[PDB]
Each structure stands twice: as structure tokens, then as C-alpha cells.
Amino acid sequence: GSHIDETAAKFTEGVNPGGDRNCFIYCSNLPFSTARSDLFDLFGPIGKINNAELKPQENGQPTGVAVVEYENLVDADFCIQKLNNYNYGGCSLQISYARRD
Numbered sequence: 001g002s003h004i005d006e007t008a009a010k011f012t013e014g015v016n017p018g019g020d021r022n023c024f025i026y027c028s029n030l031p032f033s034t035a036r037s038d039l040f041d042l043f044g045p046i047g048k049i050n051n052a053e054l055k056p057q058e059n060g061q062p063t064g065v066a067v068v069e070y071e072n073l074v075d076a077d078f079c080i081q082k083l084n085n086y087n088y089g090g091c092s093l094q095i096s097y098a099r100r101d
Contacts, residue, residue, distance in 0.1 A: 008053050009056065010101065011051060011053045011067060011069070011101070012053045012054065012055045012056060012065075012067050013055075013056065013101075014100050014101055015055070015067050015098045015099065015100055015101055016098070016099040016100060017094075017096035017097070017098070017099065018096055018097065018099050019096070019097030019098060019099040019100075020097060021073060021076075021077065021097065022076070022097045022098065022099070023069060023070060023073060023076055024067060024068065024069050024070075024076070024097065024098030024101065025043075025067065025068035025069070025070065025076055025079045025080065025095065025096070025097065025098055026065070026066075026067060026095070026096045026097065026098035026099070027039075027065065027066040027067070027068060027083070027093055027094070027095050027096075028064065028065045028066075028093070028094040028095075028096075029064055029091050029092065029093055029094045030054075030064045030065065030066055030088070030089070030091065030093060031064070031088065031089030031090065031091050032062040032064060033089065034054065034062070034064075034066070034089070035054070036052065036053065036054060039052040039053075039054075039066055039068060040052065042083065042086065042088065043068055043079060043083075046075060046078050046079050046082060046083075047070060047071060047072065047074075047075030047078060047079075048070065048071035048072070048075065049068055049069065049070060049071075050069040050070055050071055051068075051069045052066065052067065052068040052069065053066070053067055054066050054067075055067065064091075067098050068098075069098075076097075079095060080095050080096065080097065083095040084096075
């Protein structure tokens with residue numbers, strides 16, 4: 001195949017909360033000043049992130065949502081155990097299994 005940033009759209013487009021022990025993490029209610037580098041700040045000490053991105057929007061405004069993807073299903077689970085009350089920017093983050101991709 002071929003890639004540079006085409007897959008990073010697919011990594012967040014179509015993705016929703018409320019899966020069940022998939023592999024992807026859905027993260028929501030992030031503050032609107034967040035960027036891709038902030039994911040590895042709070043997720044980096046949990047385990048190995050395979051990939052991670054922020055959800056895009058049709059009008060270009062910030063969504064307040066991230067997706068993350070993890071090496072082992074114990075590490076994906078551990079994010080959803082530990083982060084689902086995490087205070088950041090003045091917001092409390094909501095965390096779930098990313099249901100479709």
C-alpha cells in the first residue's frame with residue numbers, strides 16, 4: 001500500500017464510544033487547546049500506544065475527542081480503568097472502548 005496521513009482520518013472517522021474489550025480507546029471531554037502530542041502525556045505511562053489521533057470535524061472546530069490504540073488488551077483495559085475520572089485543563093475526561101476503528 002502507501003501512507004503519510006490518509007490513515008489518520010480512518011483512525012478517528014466512524015469511531016464512537018461503547019465497544020467491549022476491542023483494542024482501541026475512545027477519550028472525550030478533552031479541553032479545546034489539546035494536540036496529538038498530549039495523548040502520549042497521560043496515556044504514555046499506562047503501556048505501549050500502537051497509534052493515537054484527535055477526532056476531525058466538518059466545519060473545522062475542535063471536537064474535544066481523542067482515539068488511542070494499544071499493543072495488549074490488558075493495556076487498553078487499564079486506560080479505561082484508570083483515566084475514566086482524570087482531571088485535565090479544568091475538564092474531567094470520559095474514557096471508553098472505541099467501537100468502530
